[PDB]
Design a protein around this motif. Structure first.
Motif, PDB file in Angstrom:
ATOM      1  N   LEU A 136       0.779  -1.260   0.000  1.00 46.58           N
ATOM      2  CA  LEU A 136       0.000   0.000   0.000  1.00 46.58           C
ATOM      3  C   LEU A 136       0.806   1.304   0.000  1.00 46.58           C
ATOM      4  CD1 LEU A 136      -2.954   1.305   0.133  1.00 46.58           C
ATOM      5  CD2 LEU A 136      -2.871   0.836   2.550  1.00 46.58           C
ATOM      6  N   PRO A 137       1.743   1.503   0.954  1.00 43.45           N
ATOM      7  CA  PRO A 137       2.495   2.745   0.912  1.00 43.45           C
ATOM      8  C   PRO A 137       3.388   2.953  -0.351  1.00 43.45           C
ATOM      9  CG  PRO A 137       3.411   1.249   2.544  1.00 43.45           C
ATOM     10  CD  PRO A 137       2.114   0.681   2.127  1.00 43.45           C
ATOM     11  N   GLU A 138       3.907   1.878  -0.945  1.00 42.86           N
ATOM     12  CA  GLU A 138       4.668   1.995  -2.181  1.00 42.86           C
ATOM     13  C   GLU A 138       3.803   2.621  -3.246  1.00 42.86           C
ATOM     14  OE1 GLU A 138       5.854  -2.187  -2.347  1.00 42.86           O
ATOM     15  OE2 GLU A 138       7.918  -1.565  -1.892  1.00 42.86           O
ATOM     16  N   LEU A 139       2.552   2.163  -3.336  1.00 47.23           N
ATOM     17  CA  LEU A 139       1.594   2.689  -4.275  1.00 47.23           C
ATOM     18  C   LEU A 139       1.127   4.119  -3.991  1.00 47.23           C
ATOM     19  CD1 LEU A 139      -0.772  -0.358  -4.913  1.00 47.23           C
ATOM     20  CD2 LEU A 139       1.370   0.213  -6.101  1.00 47.23           C
ATOM     21  N   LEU A 140       0.927   4.485  -2.727  1.00 44.89           N
ATOM     22  CA  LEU A 140       0.442   5.837  -2.390  1.00 44.89           C
ATOM     23  C   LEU A 140       1.558   6.827  -2.578  1.00 44.89           C
ATOM     24  CD1 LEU A 140      -1.717   4.954   0.827  1.00 44.89           C
ATOM     25  CD2 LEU A 140      -2.510   5.447  -1.489  1.00 44.89           C
ATOM     26  N   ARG A 141       2.775   6.431  -2.239  1.00 49.85           N
ATOM     27  CA  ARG A 141       3.921   7.270  -2.439  1.00 49.85           C
ATOM     28  C   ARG A 141       4.140   7.645  -3.930  1.00 49.85           C
ATOM     29  NH1 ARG A 141       9.940   6.089  -0.049  1.00 49.85           N
ATOM     30  NH2 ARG A 141      10.651   8.266  -0.127  1.00 49.85           N
ATOM     31  N   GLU A 142       3.977   6.677  -4.831  1.00 52.95           N
ATOM     32  CA  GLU A 142       3.930   6.920  -6.282  1.00 52.95           C
ATOM     33  C   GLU A 142       2.941   8.012  -6.637  1.00 52.95           C
ATOM     34  OE1 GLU A 142       2.995   3.183  -8.202  1.00 52.95           O
ATOM     35  OE2 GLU A 142       5.116   2.698  -8.454  1.00 52.95           O
ATOM     36  N   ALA A 143       1.784   8.000  -5.963  1.00 50.27           N
ATOM     37  CA  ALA A 143       0.676   8.914  -6.261  1.00 50.27           C
ATOM     38  C   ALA A 143       0.652  10.159  -5.392  1.00 50.27           C
ATOM     39  CB  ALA A 143      -0.650   8.163  -6.217  1.00 50.27           C
ATOM     40  N   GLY A 144       1.808  10.578  -4.883  1.00 50.67           N
ATOM     41  CA  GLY A 144       1.931  11.878  -4.225  1.00 50.67           C
ATOM     42  C   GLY A 144       1.847  11.931  -2.719  1.00 50.67           C
ATOM     43  N   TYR A 145       1.402  10.831  -2.097  1.00 55.45           N
ATOM     44  CA  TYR A 145       1.246  10.801  -0.639  1.00 55.45           C
ATOM     45  C   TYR A 145       2.582  10.860   0.068  1.00 55.45           C
ATOM     46  CZ  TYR A 145      -3.835   9.926  -0.680  1.00 55.45           C
ATOM     47  OH  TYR A 145      -5.224  10.022  -0.853  1.00 55.45           O
ATOM     48  N   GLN A 146       2.606  11.603   1.174  1.00 51.71           N
ATOM     49  CA  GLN A 146       3.690  11.503   2.150  1.00 51.71           C
ATOM     50  C   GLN A 146       3.337  10.275   3.006  1.00 51.71           C
ATOM     51  OE1 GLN A 146       4.283  15.821   3.688  1.00 51.71           O
ATOM     52  NE2 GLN A 146       2.093  15.605   3.180  1.00 51.71           N
ATOM     53  N   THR A 147       4.209   9.259   2.991  1.00 53.83           N
ATOM     54  CA  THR A 147       4.047   8.025   3.749  1.00 53.83           C
ATOM     55  C   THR A 147       4.841   8.112   5.025  1.00 53.83           C
ATOM     56  OG1 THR A 147       5.718   6.958   2.319  1.00 53.83           O
ATOM     57  CG2 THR A 147       3.478   6.675   1.755  1.00 53.83           C
ATOM     58  N   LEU A 148       4.126   8.058   6.154  1.00 61.37           N
ATOM     59  CA  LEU A 148       4.650   8.377   7.470  1.00 61.37           C
ATOM     60  C   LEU A 148       4.303   7.202   8.395  1.00 61.37           C
ATOM     61  CD1 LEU A 148       3.288  12.043   7.607  1.00 61.37           C
ATOM     62  CD2 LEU A 148       5.509  11.228   6.728  1.00 61.37           C
ATOM     63  N   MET A 149       5.260   6.727   9.170  1.00 63.51           N
ATOM     64  CA  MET A 149       5.043   5.578  10.080  1.00 63.51           C
ATOM     65  C   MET A 149       5.782   5.735  11.363  1.00 63.51           C
ATOM     66  SD  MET A 149       6.064   1.525   9.644  1.00 63.51           S
ATOM     67  CE  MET A 149       6.137   0.595  11.175  1.00 63.51           C
ATOM     68  N   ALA A 150       5.145   5.402  12.470  1.00 67.98           N
ATOM     69  CA  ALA A 150       5.824   5.233  13.741  1.00 67.98           C
ATOM     70  C   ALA A 150       5.122   4.066  14.459  1.00 67.98           C
ATOM     71  CB  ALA A 150       5.744   6.495  14.574  1.00 67.98           C
ATOM     72  N   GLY A 151       5.856   2.990  14.730  1.00 64.66           N
ATOM     73  CA  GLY A 151       5.270   1.819  15.342  1.00 64.66           C
ATOM     74  C   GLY A 151       5.970   0.526  15.054  1.00 64.66           C
ATOM     75  N   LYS A 152       5.294  -0.542  15.437  1.00 67.11           N
ATOM     76  CA  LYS A 152       5.818  -1.873  15.251  1.00 67.11           C
ATOM     77  C   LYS A 152       5.666  -2.205  13.776  1.00 67.11           C
ATOM     78  CE  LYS A 152       3.815  -6.110  16.403  1.00 67.11           C
ATOM     79  NZ  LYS A 152       3.450  -7.251  17.286  1.00 67.11           N
ATOM     80  N   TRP A 153       6.706  -2.824  13.223  1.00 62.28           N
ATOM     81  CA  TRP A 153       6.688  -3.279  11.839  1.00 62.28           C
ATOM     82  C   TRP A 153       6.346  -4.762  11.759  1.00 62.28           C
ATOM     83  CZ3 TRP A 153       5.844  -1.915   7.269  1.00 62.28           C
ATOM     84  CH2 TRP A 153       6.506  -2.458   6.134  1.00 62.28           C
ATOM     85  N   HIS A 154       7.282  -5.605  12.224  1.00 60.46           N
ATOM     86  CA  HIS A 154       7.115  -7.054  12.235  1.00 60.46           C
ATOM     87  C   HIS A 154       6.990  -7.675  10.836  1.00 60.46           C
ATOM     88  CE1 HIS A 154       5.289 -10.573  14.842  1.00 60.46           C
ATOM     89  NE2 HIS A 154       6.586 -10.718  14.638  1.00 60.46           N
ATOM     90  N   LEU A 155       7.489  -6.974   9.820  1.00 62.90           N
ATOM     91  CA  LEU A 155       7.385  -7.472   8.428  1.00 62.90           C
ATOM     92  C   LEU A 155       8.803  -7.677   7.800  1.00 62.90           C
ATOM     93  CD1 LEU A 155       4.194  -5.733   7.012  1.00 62.90           C
ATOM     94  CD2 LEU A 155       4.410  -8.103   7.646  1.00 62.90           C
TER      95      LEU A 155
END
Ligand SMILES: [Ca+2]
Ligand SMILES: [Cl-]
Ligand SMILES: [Cl-]
Ligand SMILES: [Cl-]
Length: 526
Positions: free
Chosen positions: A95-114
């Protein structure tokens, strides 16, 4: 005006813990979102953390996305198999890879576990800015035991391994408490944003996951609140769930199944300490909600909240695990904790305590559902969820329409006006979403996003489920179930109490057919 997104994920929070879901815990900020928004009583995840997260960020099944099982349980017979890589993998686009392509600032703070390696980080998977715990858990204060051969496997797998962007951190910020650090960081990123473009803000807390730890001042507010125990609590939660309309007045709760002693069988010192753990748990949830409120308060003051689609969910059922019970090969957990932590009553909830609250406190919060996290019954997979976005038609109500975590990626693409790239991306064959966009349903054009023929599969830890419409078949292996398929009519029996396998064998046979399609389409190895 394309919307911002705020996706908040609580780690092992129980269905009825929050005020607006029947709970006694003080959660004013979530309550405001929930009651204004739409509370979902039939929203589903996977039965554990990393499989759910993989689904949330791709829109497909975890057996496709790289988390066919939990990274921590990868044996030789699974390692190598496609979708069992132990990290978000090459066959999906996040999801964030796709939103970032489309102009979104992708921001995260938290557990990843991926994933734990540089190439598997939030930064590698499409977040511009990220402050992240990479493993599935860690000490909320960053207090670490010694790491050597004598360390229990569960501790070795849960170091305080934090990254900020590409920098694996050497030390933690001063006065580190996970939930506060995540709140601080997301707020930083939101304050530092480009105000003229939309954001995708991902806030996966590690609260209220064990070890149960929270600021003393907040723990103190629950002193004595849980002295009547988890069955007295469960009865409270059930009555309130009915009064609020979240569960129907005639629903029969599944019986509580635990191998620990019931509350009235415990010595006074054991009770005091178990009640203290639930108080601490409650404090973790209140402190999480406080941090959510700092984030939301800032968005509101900026005039952005009403133009932010806000999703809140837990990632799986309440955590009833007894960490001491699993013959995890290697050193003995309790003996280790006894030598390296202080779980005396007055210490519980501090950095150098390590407690979990066990199965009966967990069942108080999953009720009326059967069991809890890591099972494919409703207790482990039906989680609380709310959607707050005022542009949608369905707000201010409780909905029992079926939905899954796989719906979220497609819904958000749909709202961002971004088409899923189909079967190719960055020169690579990829899976397409199995979920469906909620937009029809939430805009009021349809009554639900799925219908009586929708088929959904779950599979993890040797357990299975397959659901079509309201009919669900469940398979629990020994020792925790009969190691045969049981059939339930979820419309009549949300507790999964009345097995209909002998009463409706044709219906069951149909579901077993769907189960095999699931296995072959997602690549389940069991
Ligand atoms: Ca979890
Ligand atoms: Cl404070
Ligand atoms: Cl009220
Ligand atoms: Cl309603």
């Amino acid at each position: 005006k394309r919307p911002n997104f705020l996706v908040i994920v609580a780690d092992d929070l129980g269905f009825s813990d929050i005020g607006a879901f029947g709970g006694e815990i003080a959660t004013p900020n979530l309550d405001a979102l929930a009651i204004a928004g739409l509370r979902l009583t039939d929203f589903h995840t996977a039965s554990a953390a990393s499989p759910t997260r993989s689904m949330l960020l791709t829109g497909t099944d975890h057996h496709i996305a790289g988390l066919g099982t939990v990274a921590e349980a990868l044996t030789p017979e699974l390692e190598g198999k496609p979708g069992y890589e132990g990290h978000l993998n090459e066959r999906v686009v996040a999801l964030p890879e796709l939103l970032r392509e489309a102009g979104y600032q992708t921001l995260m703070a938290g557990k990843w576990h991926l994933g734990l390696k540089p190439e598997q980080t939030p930064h590698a998977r499409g977040f511009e800015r990220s402050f992240s715990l990479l493993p599935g858990a860690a000490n909320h204060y960053g207090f670490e035991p010694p790491y050597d051969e004598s360390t229990p496997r569960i501790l070795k797998g849960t170091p305080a391994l934090y990254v900020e962007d590409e920098r694996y951190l050497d030390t933690l910020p001063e006065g580190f408490y996970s939930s506060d650090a995540f709140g601080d960081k997301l707020l930083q990123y939101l304050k530092e944003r480009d105000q003229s473009r939309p954001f995708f803000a991902y806030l996966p807390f590690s609260a209220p996951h064990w070890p149960l730890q929270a600021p003393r001042e907040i723990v103190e507010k629950y002193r004595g609140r849980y002295d009547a125990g988890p069955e007295a609590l469960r009865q409270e939660r059930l009555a309130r769930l009915k009064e609020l309309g979240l569960v129907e007045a005639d629903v029969e709760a599944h019986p509580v199944l635990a191998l620990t002693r019931e509350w009235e069988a415990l010595e006074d010192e054991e009770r005091a300490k178990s009640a203290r753990a639930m108080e601490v748990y409650a404090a973790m949830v209140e402190r999480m909600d406080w941090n959510i409120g700092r984030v939301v308060d800032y968005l509101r003051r900026q005039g952005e909240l009403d133009n932010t689609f806000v999703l809140f969910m837990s990632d799986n059922g309440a955590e009833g695990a007894l960490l001491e019970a699993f013959p995890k090969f290697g050193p003995d957990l309790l003996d280790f904790l006894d030598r390296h932590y202080d779980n005396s009553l007055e210490n519980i909830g501090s950095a150098n305590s390590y407690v979990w609250y066990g199965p009966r406190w967990a069942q108080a919060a999953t009720a009326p559902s059967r069991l809890y996290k890591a099972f494919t019954t409703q207790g482990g997979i039906r989680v609380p969820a709310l959607v707050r976005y005022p542009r949608l038609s369905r707000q201010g109500a409780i909905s029992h329409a079926f939905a899954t975590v796989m719906d979220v990626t497609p819904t958000l693409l749909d709202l961002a006006g971004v088409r899923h790239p189909g079967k190719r991306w960055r020169g690579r064959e990829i899976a397409e979403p199995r979920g469906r966009s909620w937009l029809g349903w939430l805009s009021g054009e349809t009554e639900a996003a799925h219908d009586e023929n929708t088929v959904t599969g779950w599979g993890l830890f040797g357990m299975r489920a397959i659901r079509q419409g309201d009919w669900k078949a469940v398979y629990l292996p020994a020792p925790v179930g009969p190691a045969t398929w049981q059939l339930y009519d979820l419309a009549r029996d949300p507790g999964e109490i009345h097995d209909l396998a002998d009463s409706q064998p044709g219906k069951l046979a149909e579901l077993i057919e769907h189960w095999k399609r699931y296995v072959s389409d997602t690549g389940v190895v069991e």
